[PDB]
A paper describes a structure:
Of all the heme peroxidases, horseradish peroxidase (HRP) is arguably the most iconic. Heme peroxidase enzymes are highly proficient in oxidizing small aromatic substrates, but HRP is the most proficient with catalytic activities that far outpace other peroxidases. Such high activity, producing easily detectable coloured or fluorescent products, makes HRP a very sensitive diagnostic tool in a wide range of biotechnological assays. But the native enzyme, as isolated from horseradish roots, is heavily glycosylated which has hampered its successful crystallization for decades.
In this work, we produced recombinant HRP in E. coli and obtained an X-ray structure of the ferric enzyme at 1.63 Å resolution. The structure contains a total of 306 residues with 15 α-helices (148 residues) and 2 anti-parallel β-sheets (6 residues). HRP contains four disulphide bonds (between residues C11–C91, C44–C49, C97–C301, and C177–C209), which are highly conserved among the class III peroxidases and observed in our structure. Additionally, there are two calcium ions present in the structure, although not in the vicinity of the active site. The distance between the heme iron and the Nε atom of the proximal His 170 is 2.0 Å, while that between the heme iron and Nε of distal histidine (His 42) is 6.1 Å. An ethylene glycol (EDO) situated at the δ-heme edge of the active site is at 4.0 Å from iron (Fe–O2). Ethylene glycol does not interact with the heme iron, but potentially forms hydrogen bonds with the distal histidine (O2-Nε = 2.7 Å) and arginine (O2-Nε = 3.1 Å, O1-Nη = 3.0 Å) residues. There is no distal water molecule within the bonding distance of the iron on the distal side, and there is no ferulic acid binding at the δ-heme edge (as has been observed in previous HRP structures). Hence, multiple steps of crystallization may have led to the removal of ferulic acid from the HRP active site, which was occupied by ethylene glycol during cryoprotection.
Author numbering: 1 to 306
The structure:
């Protein structure tokens, strides 16, 4: 029962406030649009899009920010605080942090050249955070294709089109050397590189991520257009130039009979990818929301109201 018109009477300019915050932030941090999209993904995969990920530690629950998928990885929380403060100034006690993050994710994709659409709204904010659930639910870059599929199925995204389209989020943003070292030097305990990685690209990545190098050094997910939201992600996969294992699995796994045609169709038509990305984003945004009088309108996104 989420609806795109939820704030049309109570805070009609919310989307513009969000967009203006991201644009101002992009002036100093060109990565923030990618980081915000990822925060929304990590919100939704853990008890639904309920802003659980934004809560700080308390003595009764641990923050999801300490999860393996978030710690020293997720970023942009201060930007969310800034846009929440601005929306609170304009429409007090009205817009949930969960909806704010959803809007910010959509605006981030559009600002980077991606599709533009009106997200469903009406989510409410959780009363707790779910660290253990984050550690169980968030997929990992060394997952095989059946494990990736199971990770999406576990949160309610059954369709291979969900997985292939949402993986297109890696058409922009950055990845730490840590998560590709195995592919470059010791894949599956062979002491050898991943044979599905293009051998010329292998040499490039070894130059960026040497053995004994800084594991926190960042590499672009999309070697073609690292900052533009477009379908080049899938073109890379067809050339064996997916960056992390879970990217290339979509095209090269023995289990990819159903994902290969999707990768090819998205590589062949930007419109096909953009349509599928919006559809999959709206489904992800629909994972187990609190609505109505459930949850609250959190006033400070880091803490429950008191
Ligand atoms: C399918 C399983 C997925 C896996 C295994 C995965 C894994 C990763 C990893 C390892 C990173 C780098 C994090 C770091 O270096 O600290 C990353 C970044 C990113 N992920 Fe994914 N991810 C997945 C799905 C998604 C989805 C569904 C989205 C959004 C629709 C997404 C959007 C992003 C973005 C935008 C970044 C870059 C963030 C930044 O530069 O701050 N990913 N992901
Ligand atoms: O796939 P649905 O029916 O949970 O939207
Ligand atoms: Ca959540
Ligand atoms: Ca791109």
């Amino acid at each position: 029962q989420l609806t795109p018109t939820f704030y049309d009477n109570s805070c009609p300019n919310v989307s513009n406030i969000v967009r203006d915050t991201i644009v101002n932030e992009l002036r100093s941090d060109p990565r923030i649009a990618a980081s915000i999209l990822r925060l929304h993904f990590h919100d939704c995969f853990v008890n639904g899009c309920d802003a659980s990920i934004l809560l700080d530690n308390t003595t009764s629950f641990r923050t999801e920010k300490d999860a393996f998928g978030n710690a020293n990885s997720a970023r942009g929380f201060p930007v969310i605080d800034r846009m929440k403060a601005a929306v609170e100034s304009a429409c007090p006690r009205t817009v949930s942090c969960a909806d704010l993050l959803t809007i910010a994710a959509q605006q981030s994709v559009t600002l980077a050249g991606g599709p533009s659409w009106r997200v469903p709204l009406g989510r409410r904010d959780s009363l707790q955070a779910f660290l253990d659930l984050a550690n169980a639910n968030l997929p990992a870059p060394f997952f095989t294709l059946p494990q990736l599929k199971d990770s999406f199925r576990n949160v309610g995204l059954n369709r291979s089109s969900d997985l292939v389209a949402l993986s297109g989020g890696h058409t922009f943003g950055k990845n730490q050397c840590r998560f590709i070292m195995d592919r470059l030097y010791n894949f599956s305990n062979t002491g050898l590189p991943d044979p599905t990685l293009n051998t010329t690209y292998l040499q490039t990545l070894r130059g960026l991520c040497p053995l004994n190098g800084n594991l926190s050094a960042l590499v672009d997910f999309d070697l073609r257009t690292p900052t533009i939201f477009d379908n080049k992600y899938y073109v890379n996969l067809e050339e064996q130039k997916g960056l992390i294992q879970s990217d290339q699995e979509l095209f090269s796994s023995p289990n990819a009979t159903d994902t290969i045609p999707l990768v090819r169709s998205f590589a062949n038509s930007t419109q096909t990818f953009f349509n599928a990305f919006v559809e999959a984003m709206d489904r992800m945004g629909n994972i187990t929301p609190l609505t109505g009088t459930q949850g609250q309108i959190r006033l400070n996104c880091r803490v429950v109201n008191s």
